[PDB]
From a paper:
Two moderately broad and potent, clonally related monoclonal antibodies isolated from a single donor, 3BC176 and 3BC315, recognize a glycan-independent epitope that was proposed to be located in the vicinity of the V3 loop and CD4-induced (CD4i) site5. Structural analyses of the 3BC315 and 3BC176 fragment antigen binding (Fab) by X-ray crystallography, and in complexes with BG505 SOSIP.664 by single-particle cryo-electron microscopy (cryo-EM), reveal that the 3BC315 and 3BC176 epitopes are very similar and situated at the interface between two gp41 subunits. To study the paratopes of 3BC315 and 3BC176, their corresponding Fabs were crystallized and their structures were determined to 1.95 and 1.89 Å resolution, respectively. Like many HIV-1 bnAbs, the 3BC315 and 3BC176 Fabs have long CDRH3s, both being 19 residues, in comparison to the average human CDRH3 length of ∼15 residues25.
Residue numbers in the entry:
A (entry chain H): 1 to 52, 52A, 53 to 82, 82A, 82B, 82C, 83 to 100, 100A, ...
B (entry chain L): 2 to 9, 11 to 27, 27A, 27B, 27C, 28 to 95, 95A, 96 to 106, ...
Amino acid sequence: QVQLMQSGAQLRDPGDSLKISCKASGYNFIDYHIHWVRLAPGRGLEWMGWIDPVGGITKYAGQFQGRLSLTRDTSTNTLFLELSRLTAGDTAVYFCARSMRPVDHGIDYSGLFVFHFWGRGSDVLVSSASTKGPSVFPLAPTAALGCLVKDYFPEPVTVSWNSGALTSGVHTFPAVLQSSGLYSLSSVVTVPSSSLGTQTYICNVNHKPSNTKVDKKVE
Amino acid sequence: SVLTQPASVSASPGQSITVSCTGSRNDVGGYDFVSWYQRHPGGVPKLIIYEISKRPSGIPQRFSGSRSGNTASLTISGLQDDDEADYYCCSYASYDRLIFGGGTRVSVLRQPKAAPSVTLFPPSSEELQANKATLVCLISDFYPGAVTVAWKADGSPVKAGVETTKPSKQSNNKYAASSYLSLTPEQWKSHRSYSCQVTHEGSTVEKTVAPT
């Protein structure tokens, strides 16, 4: 019956604040410390801090000191996280989680140190884009050749080859998100070499959000 | 601080694996408050072990935890498909801190291991003329879906400007990933080579490109 209901995903500008909420039910709200933890790319889970619902006392992890504020509204059983001055490093999934057991002050703190029930997570992306069309570059060369579809926002992009005629050996990779907050992907085709120079290869890129339709010949 | 875990481990159904979590006397070694969390791709973390070796409700005894010195270990016997996940250790740290490990991908092998095909592209002439440079490392057809990528400029490690994707399941149940190194053109032309190094199941594949 223990449930933690988090607010949803968000897209935020660098320099904005992130505010998320977590509503608790199925237990006596004031008896349990609440933790916030995030899952950030290239990093594992990262503990952010805890809050005591009794008097609102908190403890913040070192890296969030001076930019994190955890609060609570007891009358609505709701917990709030406010994270200030966002950067690209704050793109992550944010979780609230309940401590295992109430604290017995001066006697036992063991239950404070375990995350037992978890919110569903708030998937956050920090980007100051703004719709933006990609720049397309050839990836010059069985041999492998491609197109780099660089710096667009938002998803998606579609790539075909030779006006749709070429499909075998085509591998269009999932996009990466750069610290600029812009997406890039590559599409690669593996062609019989000897057909090289004999055959022309053109990638046809479409980014509907910005209404860009680019053809790029790969020499 | 980040407790140190291996990047990945794998085994077949019915077998056992162990994941280590190495910390210090001010955390794993200093207190009996070590816990482990299981997280499925796209999923929510779930508590598996607490106080080093205790199991909460709903966890079968084939999951077990231990500690030796500053290193905690999670062992999973009788591996099942549901066990494929990222596992994170966590410890209390003095004073009034909690710290996580970097996570370990446990894979439950359901087809043979397959090493990654790696293709590295240098920056295009057109991109350089736009006063920018990107190296593109494409990684395909590997199984199971766990890799790490490191970049070298000449003989040295390069950490700045690297963005790497998570593995994505392909149609054929193998995986694909990619890594991008963003450089200034000056930076690109100032070295004699750049390398993309892809590690998978303990072996590293390396591709190299040169500005000249």
